[PDB]
Amino acid sequence: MKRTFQPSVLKRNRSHGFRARMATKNGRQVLARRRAKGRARLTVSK
Amino acid sequence: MIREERLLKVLRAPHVSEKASTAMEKSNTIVLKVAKDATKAEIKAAVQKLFEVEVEVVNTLVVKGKVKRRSDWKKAYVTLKEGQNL
Amino acid sequence: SRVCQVTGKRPVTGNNRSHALNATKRRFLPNLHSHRFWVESEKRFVTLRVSAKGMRVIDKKGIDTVLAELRARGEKY
Amino acid sequence: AAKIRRDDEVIVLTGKDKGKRGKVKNVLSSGKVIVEGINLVKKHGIVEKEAAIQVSNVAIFNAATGKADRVGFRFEDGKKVRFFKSNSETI
Amino acid sequence: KAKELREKSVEELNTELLNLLREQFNLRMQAASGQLQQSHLLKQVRRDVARVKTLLNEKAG
RNA sequence: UAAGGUGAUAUGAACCGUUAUAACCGGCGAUUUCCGAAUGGGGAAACCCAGUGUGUUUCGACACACUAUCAUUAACUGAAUCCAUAGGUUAAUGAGGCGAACCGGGGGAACUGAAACAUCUAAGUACCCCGAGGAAAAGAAAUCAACCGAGAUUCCCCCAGUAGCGGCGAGCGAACGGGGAGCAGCCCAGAGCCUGAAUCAGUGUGUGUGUUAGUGGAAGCGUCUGGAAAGGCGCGCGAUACAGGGUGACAGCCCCGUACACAAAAAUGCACAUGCUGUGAGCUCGAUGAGUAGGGCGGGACACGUGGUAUCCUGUCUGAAUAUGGGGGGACCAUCCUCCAAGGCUAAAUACUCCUGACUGACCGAUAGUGAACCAGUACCGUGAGGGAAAGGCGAAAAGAAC
RNA sequence: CGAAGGUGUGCUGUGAGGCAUGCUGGAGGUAUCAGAAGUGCGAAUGCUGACAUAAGUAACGAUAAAGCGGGUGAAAAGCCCGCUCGCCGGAAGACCAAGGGUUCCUGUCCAACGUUAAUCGGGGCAGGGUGAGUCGACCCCUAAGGCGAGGCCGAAAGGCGUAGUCGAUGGGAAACAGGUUAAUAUUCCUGUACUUGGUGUUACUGCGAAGGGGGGACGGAGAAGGCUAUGUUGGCCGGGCG
RNA sequence: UACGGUGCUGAAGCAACAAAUGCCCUGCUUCCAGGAAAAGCCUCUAAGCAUCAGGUAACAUCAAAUCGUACCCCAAACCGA
């Protein structure tokens, strides 16, 4: 059966990547939250 | 012109392996580790100057870093015209 | 936005109260209208978005001094 | 600001070697010293090295009073000089 | 080592810099090739390039 | 400031230094890749693609700078359109983003309690957003009082769970007045006289104090058990230091210190003294903040739910007097009391802790205390926001066991 | 010259308990009288870690399929090699994209991993391997869409959108056959090519837009014809004579 | 010969028939549901440039960077612990 995760690097970066986070203030708050917590990997952008 | 300093920076070390040897003795080509940002042109000029040999062409490939912590480095296939280098 | 160029009236919030005093958060809006004012000194019509009280203030003070106020605080007209 | 240096003939205060005399061969940064021929680690067969010992455990040897001594610091000729405390004699 | 560099002029500070870089290249090539047991020359030459262009920077105003 | 070093790992290897230019620590510099406000344009972050100059060139090329947007200011030129404007262009100057709480605004719940629920409560709380500063806000009476008076705000203790408010239910809840902390007031709406006339910041100094390296410090041995003494035992000594921490068991005298006395090339802070710089005094006559006060309507805020509702605010519509004037004194009116709105500014006492240093706990001691003592926001999980561990201890010394 | 803790044993008190000292341990512990508690567990379908039980029970993942000989090793049903036998064959073969990320190739090893053993492995460890003007990306251009100077709006945050700028899943220039490595090949090598610019030189000349017009540049079904890949047969050539 | 494999030499190398769902063909025919866009490209000029610049042809020379290239890929390398 087809499962839910069908990976696509382009779609991943467009949907959750660093510049997508930076696009809106709500994303920048996601980034601020993740820095405040000290995440080693700040976004999906690899 | 590519100036002296960059040439002094672009050549890291001669790559030594079975492929590198057989390349030297069959294609008259030498294999080098070069700075990861070095260019066909920069490698060409640097080899011609620092090694005082004449080069036909340069082929470059970046070797991806192996899990451990190996950094990505660029390998250069330098095809000499007729000078014996080393 | 719905702000009067002259007075600075904005939408304000308040309650709407039924007969049983049920309260519903609501807004009161300024009575804004966009109207062209003859500026005699500049020989041009300036369009301002003013409340009706804005026009009354224009009537007392005159458009020249009101425009002076707008420049002073940097409102662009 | 040391009170025990390399060239220094010193006596041991604690640890199977009380009273033995020797020269400080090396001074480890962890506050331990290698002293000439005191803390011999004998393992197997042949001669082996001297294990480290705390500097706190050795005292400078006065060698005139023939007894251990404490060291002090003064400024003779505008220069830090070490001196034996129980004698006031510059080292 | 920086003193005798200080009385040296900008012109000869560049010649020395080039000389140091050629030496750095040579030492790198020996070290990579397996000889050059005097492995400290590498740090020495990096340090010498550092002071040479430190001086050479501070001459330029 | 040094006889030792080259961060740990960490062995090694190669070395470097020994009064002085080894290392190390402080001040001041230089360099500082790419991404990221990211800003030369783009982009799926850490990449792609430039233009314009200025040089260089070995003619293949190369280097280095600049170039985002906005606001303001100036210059230039400049449409309909005639002047003009709108626009355009070019500089200069700022701003942008981030950061824990605190603080001021603009928005604004619900669960809940009322033993149901709709008024009410929760609660102007959570949350969202915007803006500042070391605090912020507020602040110099159109204030209370009561016929005596007090005298700007903020904070604390009272008043007082009082007076009230309240489907007069749940609940909510003041003042006046007193004790304190702290505590100076000013300025324009304007001109004369006077005329830097004290002045509050800016800077350059000079001095005194901090601060960012450091310096010296005061004194103990014998014997016994033990693997080791720091324990016991004997006899001493220092002490403005018997704070602590180590050291092989339990050390005032072994070490690091401790009390105490000192130090600063330089760079900073903080007082003063100056020099100067924008600034203004004093004086005398003026002036005294209008779509405002107030009212009608709808709301909101005051403990006060519209109630007999004062007072404040403003969405909407109106609309004065103006110092022989007006506001307030809990409907309202008279009286006599008090103050001057419709412009500002302002220290202190007050709040808070991302951080830094010291020091302390009838605080914890690895299922505890931080989620995390251990390379933890890690492994890991999720599509992503987000969730989220488990895991310390050989010995005094690796002497970590040759054969 | 033996602290707490642990494990025994004796004695004692109405109990909760206390006390003594064998052993282990190896460094702390505290009568007394006061004071403060994160002060006492068997249960909460409690919480966390350990370890039971069923039980050596079920199972060991397509009923395509195995059998010998030799090798190697400590050991081989499973590894290698050989010979057979079975199975797929529009796939269970080959080649990619997406995705993954070094799994690739070689040498060692056998702890764990692999549902068994393993000498084997996509496992561990070490060394290597990805070579381009022509293939792709980047790049020129655009679609859906996104963003968007100004702008028009909206308590704020923001929404929409013009010039523009991005955005392929689409349109824009060009290399093929042989040979090669343990692992790369339209990339290396060999042969034979081709494309697009710049720069000169020579000849000859109207060149020059953000503008105009062509072109790119297009549906579904169906029906031929002409072909080729490809097969089959003859011939040919090399071998055969069971 | 390492028994893996490597080197060396090399004959014929044609014809007929049958052929795709591939090519001609984005063609053709028909149909109604009436079937992207822009650039490269080609031509025309405008402002301008003017014995210039450009264009066009020949010929020479040079430049074509940077990055992906291993391996799996209907699967034991992806998505399903």
UniProtKB/Swiss-Prot annotation, chain A:
Keywords: Ribonucleoprotein, Ribosomal protein. GO terms for biological process: cytoplasmic translation. InterPro entries: Ribosomal_bL34, Ribosomal_bL34_CS. GO terms for cellular component: cytoplasm; cytosolic large ribosomal subunit. PROSITE patterns: RIBOSOMAL_L34. Pfam families: Ribosomal_L34. The keyword Ribosomal protein applies. Part of the 50S ribosomal subunit. Belongs to the bacterial ribosomal protein bL34 family. This is Large ribosomal subunit protein bL34. It comes from Escherichia coli (strain K12).
Swiss-Prot record, chain B:
One of its GO terms (cellular component) is cytoplasm. Pfam families: Ribosomal_L23. PROSITE patterns: RIBOSOMAL_L23. One of its GO terms (biological process) is cytoplasmic translation. GO terms for molecular function: rRNA binding; structural constituent of ribosome. Changing E18Q: Strongly reduces trigger factor binding. Changing E18A: Binds normally to ribosomes; strongly reduces trigger factor binding. Keywords: Ribonucleoprotein, Ribosomal protein, RNA-binding, rRNA-binding. InterPro entries: Nucleotide-bd_a/b_plait_sf (IPR012677), Ribosomal_uL23-like (IPR013025), Ribosomal_uL23/eL15/eS24_sf (IPR012678), Ribosomal_uL23_CS (IPR001014). Gene3D superfamilies: 3.30.70.330. Part of the 50S ribosomal subunit. Contacts protein L29 and trigger factor. Might also contact SecE and probably does contact SecG and SecY when the SecYEG translocation complex is docked with the ribosome. One of the early assembly proteins, it binds 23S rRNA; is essential for growth. One of the proteins that surround the polypeptide exit tunnel on the outside of the subunit. Acts as the docking site for trigger factor for Ffh binding to the ribosome (SRP54) and to nascent polypeptide chains. Belongs to the universal ribosomal protein uL23 family. PANTHER family: 60S RIBOSOMAL PROTEIN L23A. This is Large ribosomal subunit protein uL23. The gene is rplW.
UniProtKB/Swiss-Prot annotation, chain C:
GO terms for cellular component: cytoplasm; cytosol; cytosolic large ribosomal subunit. Keywords: Ribonucleoprotein, Ribosomal protein, RNA-binding, rRNA-binding. Coiled coil: none annotated. GO terms for molecular function: rRNA binding; structural constituent of ribosome. SUPFAM superfamilies: L28p-like. It comes from the Bacteria. One of its GO terms (biological process) is ribosomal large subunit assembly. PANTHER family: 39S RIBOSOMAL PROTEIN L28, MITOCHONDRIAL (PTHR13528), LARGE RIBOSOMAL SUBUNIT PROTEIN BL28M (PTHR13528:SF2). Part of the 50S ribosomal subunit. Belongs to the bacterial ribosomal protein bL28 family. This is Large ribosomal subunit protein bL28.
UniProtKB/Swiss-Prot annotation, chain E:
Pfam families: Ribosomal_L29. This is Large ribosomal subunit protein uL29. Binds 23S rRNA. It is not essential for growth. GO terms for cellular component: cytoplasm; cytosolic large ribosomal subunit. PROSITE patterns: RIBOSOMAL_L29. Disruption phenotype: Cells missing both S17 and L29 grow very slowly and have a rather unstable temperature-sensitive phenotype. Belongs to the universal ribosomal protein uL29 family. Keywords: Ribonucleoprotein, Ribosomal protein, RNA-binding, rRNA-binding. The gene is rpmC. GO terms for molecular function: rRNA binding; structural constituent of ribosome. InterPro entries: Ribosomal_protein_uL29 (IPR050063), Ribosomal_uL29 (IPR001854), Ribosomal_uL29_CS (IPR018254), Ribosomal_uL29_sf (IPR036049).
